[PDB]
Amino acid sequence: APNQALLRILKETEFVLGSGTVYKGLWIPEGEKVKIPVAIKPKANKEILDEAYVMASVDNPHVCRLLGICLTSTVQLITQLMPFGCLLDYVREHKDNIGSQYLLNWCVQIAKGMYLEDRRLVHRDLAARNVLVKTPQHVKITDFGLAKEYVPIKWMALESILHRIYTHQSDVWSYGVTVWELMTFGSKPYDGIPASEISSILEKGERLPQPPICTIDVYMIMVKCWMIDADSRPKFRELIIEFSKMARDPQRYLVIQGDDVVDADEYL
Numbered sequence: 343a344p345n346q347a348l349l350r351i352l353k354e355t356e357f358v359l360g361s362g363t364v365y366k367g368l369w370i371p372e373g374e375k376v377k378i379p380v381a382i383k384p385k386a387n388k389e390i391l392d393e394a395y396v397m398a399s400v401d402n403p404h405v406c407r408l409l410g411i412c413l414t415s416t417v418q419l420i421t422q423l424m425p426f427g428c429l430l431d432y433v434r435e436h437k438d439n440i441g442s443q444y445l446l447n448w449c450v451q452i453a454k455g456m457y458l459e460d461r462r463l464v465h466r467d468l469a470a471r472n473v474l475v476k477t478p479q480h481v482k483i484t485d486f487g488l489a490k491e492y493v494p495i496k497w498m499a500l501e502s503i504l505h506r507i508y509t510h511q512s513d514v515w516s517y518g519v520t521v522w523e524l525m526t527f528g529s530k531p532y533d534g535i536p537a538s539e540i541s542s543i544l545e546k547g548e549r550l551p552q553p554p555i556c557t558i559d560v561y562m563i564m565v566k567c568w569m570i571d572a573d574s575r576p577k578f579r580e581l582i583i584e585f586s587k588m589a590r591d592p593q594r595y596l597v598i599q600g601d602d603v604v605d606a607d608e609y610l
């Protein structure tokens with residue numbers, strides 16, 4: 343099928359978060375009285391254009407939307423500003439305030455976004471750092487610098503480490519690790535263990551431990567994402583169904599103590 347997506351080129355005259363350098367700013371298209379909060383981000387240019395290609399070809403409420411590119415000294419990525427940052431730093435900074443409702447709803451939304459399978463698109467870098475927070479009730483998947491059967495070792499499936507094979511089911515493995523990051527409130531997977539030994543550990547049968555707040559119901563879903571047989575791992579459509587049921591009774595599945603500005607989503 344022909345990819346009829348539109349690549350919008352933005353004037354520099356129409357415009358620091360992290361350090362390349364990603365900046366926070368406002369996009370003001372000429373004429374229309376609208377201010378849009380945005381994030382402004384030969385080998386370097388070739389890869390950011392590949393990333394712009396992917397983001398321009400996706401359109402889903404749980405996938406970061408591309409607004410356009412600006413052709414200056416270096417090509418700039420202009421995307422929607424997610425004011426609450428990445429989900430990894432968010433759960434670390436707000437441990438003592440994340441309830442079971444938010445955790446289970448985030449798992450639903452991330453599984454919904456991983457739409458990417460409908461687009462026949464493999465992310466190859468799903469992680470808590472690559473999930474941005476528009477609002478505490480709305481997260482989106484980002485970072486398509488590795489998007490493409492067809493590197494962060496501690497998030498990859500065993501077949502990806504041994505044979506460099508990436509499928510939608512290898513993304514399911516990374517989804518399981520990402521859920522583990524949220525349920526541990528931002529712990530580092532295999533903390534201390536060097537990356538070179540991850541291949542030997544997964545082969546012996548060892549996995550990430552059961553997070554303290556996780557009932558066996560939730561931890562069983564993560565274990566199923568970490569099976570050797572990729573086709574035995576659950577599908578993203580099934581993970582949507584499972585986490586949705588649990589989100590209707592969150593305290594039964596997570597045990598936690600004490601439980602003219604226009605946004606880009608409205609500039610269509």
Ligand SMILES: *CCC(=O)Nc1cc(Nc2nccc(-c3cnc4c(C)cccn34)n2)c(OC)cc1N(C)CCN(C)C
Nearest residue numbers: 359360364381421422423424425426427428430431471474
């Ligand atoms: C895990 C880090 C992080 O996401 N920090 C962050 C993100 C904000 N929002 C936002 N919106 C759109 C695009 C980005 C973005 C895209 N690529 C990057 C990189 C490589 C680094 C940082 C942001 N990127 N981000 C945001 O908006 C307020 C703030 C932050 N922080 C600065 C919080 C992290 N801080 C505690 C270090």
